[PDB]
Amino acid sequence: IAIPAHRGLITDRNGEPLAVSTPVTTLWANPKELMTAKERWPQLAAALGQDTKLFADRIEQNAEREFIYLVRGLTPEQGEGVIALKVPGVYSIEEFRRFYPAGEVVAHAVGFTDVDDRGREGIELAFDEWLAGVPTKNAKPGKTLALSIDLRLQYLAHRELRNALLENGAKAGSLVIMDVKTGEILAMTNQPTYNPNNRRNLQPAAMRNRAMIDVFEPGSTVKPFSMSAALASGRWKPSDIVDVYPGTLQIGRYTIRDVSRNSRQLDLTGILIKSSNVGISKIAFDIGAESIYSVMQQVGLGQDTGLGFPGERVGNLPNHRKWPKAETATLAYGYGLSVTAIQLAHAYAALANDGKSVPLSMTRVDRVPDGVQVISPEVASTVQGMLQQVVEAQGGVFRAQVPGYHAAGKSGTARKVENAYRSLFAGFAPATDPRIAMVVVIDEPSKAGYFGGLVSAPVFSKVMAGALRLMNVPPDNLP
Numbered sequence: 088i089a090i091p092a093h094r095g096l097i098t099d100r101n102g103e104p105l106a107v108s109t110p111v112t113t114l115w116a117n118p119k120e121l122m123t124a125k126e127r128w129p130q131l132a133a134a135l136g137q138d139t140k141l142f143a144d145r146i147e148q149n150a151e152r153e154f155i156y157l158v159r160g161l162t163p164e165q166g167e168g169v170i171a172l173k174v175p176g177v178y179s180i181e182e183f184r185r186f187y188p189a190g191e192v193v194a195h196a197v198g199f200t201d202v203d204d205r206g207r208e209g210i211e212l213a214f215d216e217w218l219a220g221v222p223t224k225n226a227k228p229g230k231t232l233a234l235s236i237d238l239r240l241q242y243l244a245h246r247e248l249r250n251a252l253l254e255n256g257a258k259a260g261s262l263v264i265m266d267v268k269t270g271e272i273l274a275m276t277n278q279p280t281y282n283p284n285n286r287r288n289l290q291p292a293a294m295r296n297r298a299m300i301d302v303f304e305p306g307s308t309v310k311p312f313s314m315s316a317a318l319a320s321g322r323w324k325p326s327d328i329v330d331v332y333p334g335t336l337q338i339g340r341y342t343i344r345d346v347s348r349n350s351r352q353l354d355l356t357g358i359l360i361k362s363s364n365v366g367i368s369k370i371a372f373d374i375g376a377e378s379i380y381s382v383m384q385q386v387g388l389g390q391d392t393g394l395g396f397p398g399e400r401v402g403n404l405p406n407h408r409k410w411p412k413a414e415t416a417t418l419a420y421g422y423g424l425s426v427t428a429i430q431l432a433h434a435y436a437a438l439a440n441d442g443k444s445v446p447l448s449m450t451r452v453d454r455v456p457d458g459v460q461v462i463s464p465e466v467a468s469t470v471q472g473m474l475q476q477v478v479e480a481q482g483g484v485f486r487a488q489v490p491g492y493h494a495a496g497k498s499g500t501a502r503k504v505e506n507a508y509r510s511l512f513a514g515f516a517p518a519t520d521p522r523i524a525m526v527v528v529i530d531e532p533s534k535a536g537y538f539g540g541l542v543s544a545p546v547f548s549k550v551m552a553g554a555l556r557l558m559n560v561p562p563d564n565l566p
Contacts, residue, residue, distance in 0.1 A: 092220030094185065094204060095229030097197060097211075099238040100271070100451045104188050106197050106211065111184040112166025114157040118150045120176030127174040134169045160184055189238060191280045192245045195296040196236060196272075196449070199283040208294070210234065210449060213395045233451040235271035240264050243553045244274040251529065251546045252278055255539060259530035261298040262546070263432040264554055267515060267524050269452040270436070270445035273554070275299075275429070297528070298428045302402045305388075305431055306421040306499035307362045308513045311438060311470050312386060313419045314355060316378040317370045318466045325355045325469060331365040338412045343368050343420075346500075356473045359497065360483050364420040371419035376410035379419055385444070385461040386434035388426050392447050402426045421499065432526040435496075435513045438474075439521030442467030471495055475518035484512075487544035489552045491562040493518040498541055501528070508536050512543035516551050517563045523554050 097106035114135075121128075125143075132142035135158055149155050157177065161169075170179050185200050187193070198209015206215030210232065220227040244262045252260050264274035281293035295301070317323040334348020345363050358366035371379060384390065389404025402425045407414060417423035426434075429447070437444035442462030445455065462470070474495035478487045484498050496514020503509065510529040515521040527546045532539030555562075 089222040089224035090226035091222055092226050093228035094183065094200070095218040095220075096231045097218070098231070098233050099236045099241070100233060100273075101237065102233070103238040105193055105234065105236070105238070106185060106187050108183040109186045110163055111159070111182045112161040112163050113159040113180050113182050114161065114166060114169055115178055115180065116146070116155055116157050117153050117176045117178070118146055118155060119153060121146050121174070122150055122176075124175045127172070131169070131172060131174050131177065134172060187283045189241070190284060191282045192241055192276070193236060193238070194280050194283050195277045195294075195298070196234070196275050197283070199286070208397055209296070212397050213449070235266075235273065235448050235451055236275070237264075237273045237557070239557045240274040240554050241276060243557070244550050245276040245280075247546055247550050247553075248276050248278055248527070251542070255529070255532045255542055256534070257529050257532050257542070258535075259295075259297060261301070261428045261526070261528040262550065263298050263428050263526045264550070265432045265436045265524040266452075267436040267439040267521050268445070269455050270433075270448045271452050272429075272447060272449055273523070296396070296398065297530075299392075299394075299396055300398045300400045300427070301503070301528075302400050302425040302427055303501035303503045303507075303509050303511075303528070304422045304424065305426050306501055306511065308431060308497050308499035308511050309383060309388065309421040309424070309426075309434075310359060310362065310367050310419070311474060311497055312382050312388075312434065313367050313371060313379050314359060314473065315438070315462050315466055315470050316382045317355070317374050318469055319382070319463060320374040320378055322374060323355065323370065325473070328352045328354055329358060329363075329366045329369050331358075331361075331363045331369075334363075334365060336365045336368060338416065341413050341416075343416055356476050356480075359473050359477050360480055362498070364416070367419045368416040371415050372412060376407070376415040376418055379415075380404070380406060382462065383418075383424065383434075385459070386437045387430050387444065388434055389424055390430070392429060392433065394429075394447055394449055396449070400427060402430060422502065428526045428528045431511075431513050432524055435515055435526065436524040437461055438467055438470060439495075439515035439524050441521075471518060471521065474514065478514070478518075484541065484544050486541060487512060487514060487547050489516055489548055489555065489564075491564055492516050492552070492555060492560075493564045494548070494551060495521075496525075496544075496547060498544055500540075507531065510539065510542045512541075512547045514547055514551070516555060517560065519563050522558065522560050523551060525551055525554075
């Protein structure tokens with residue numbers, strides 16, 4: 088008997104158990120031996136919770152066999168209660184059942200194991216070799232894995248994303264919380280979600296890890312990165328003015344149209360506040376799409392994350408030797424590419440980390456890796472101040488303001504090309520010394536093609552406020 092291996096424990100970043108192999112008890116029987124004690128069967132059938140006739144049927148039907156299971160997955164205490172009856176032919180072997188104490192809250196991140204206790208999805212699959220040991224014959228146990236997830240932030244993001252969808256009647260949603268300095272994924276919740284313990288049913292739409300496999304056109308949420316390429320070109324400064332009247336711009340056959348068409352002159356910050364597609368397009372025409380593509384590619388948009396998660400969609404950041412005006416514009420205002428919510432959070436973390444990009448991590452980061460300075464500290468600081476103005480200035484996204492803090496971020500309207508409406512908000516806080524980056528995705532707020540609009544911003548406000556408190560970040564907006 089080459090003994091099996093004990094599956095390693097998965098915890099959150101602070102040791103809270105997320106996937107523990109708990110001991111269970113399995114009762115089996117030798118039918119030829121049980122046949123000599125038929126008068127014990129009604130008592131034994133009752134202790135197993137089974138019908139007297141149906142239980143007697145199983146034994147007599149498999150009388151020539153010498154091994155059948157009576158019941159698997161019992162608790163140690165319940166298994167000893169039946170063994171205490173000392174019915175001839177009833178034997179016991181203690182097994183291991185994978186249990187997930189957090190249940191549906193970390194379902195998509197943790198994943199699950201199959202019948203042969205092998206990693207099938209989530210972390211259970213990405214670290215299956217690490218969590219499963221090797222099978223007298225000596226058997227070594229599996230190693231412990233501590234995730235980057237903060238279970239406190241995870242519970243917060245889960246219930247706030249759930250409460251927001253029920254309030255608006257949305258079909259689905261995603262929320263990613265990220266530590267901008269360490270690259271750690273502090274929280275990643277998806278709706279709808281399933282219970283990995285209660286897998287009698289198996290709804291396929293609930294097992295969808297949308298934060299990593301759903302791709303969408305980020306829209307205005309990448310305009311800060313176009314602005315970053317403008318500021319790094321040496322041709323634009325924050326006081327420069329762009330004329331966006333009358334809210335439309337004709338480029339040959341196509342016509343760029345702004346969502347709000349009530350502006351004429353805007354400075355660079357007002358282009359972000361008003362979220363003008365015309366304004367960001369005129370900037371892109373001057374600096375060229377290559378400088379914008381380079382920034383988006385360096386912050387990870389459309390790039391492999393390196394997390395090794397199953398089903399991870401990379402997205403698509405198109406590249407061209409020669410960029411026409413149409414492809415330049417659509418890239419500049421976020422409809423010329425497709426990303427995941429994880430990639431968008433990673434890119435915002437770089438901007439918040441004063442322009443230094445750090446590799447994503449699903450496990451706890453002890454030694455912080457050397458970053459890549461993608462955006463200069465001076466340009467990153469300037470864009471940070473602009474995104475703070477997007478949230479705090481006149482006509483800005485006021486629903487995203489965090490009480491007692493200076494928050495910064497950008498709202499968008501994603502499109503999955505038949506097309507699908509998603510509401511986006513990506514941000515970080517505190518604006519004056521960023522610690523946390525967050526991306527909120529809401530699939531069709533009211534309905535598919537509705538008029539809800541800014542629905543993700545209030546979720547950003549409530550979750551960021553809680554995450555800053557849970558991490559004891561000092562308030563920097565004390566009036």
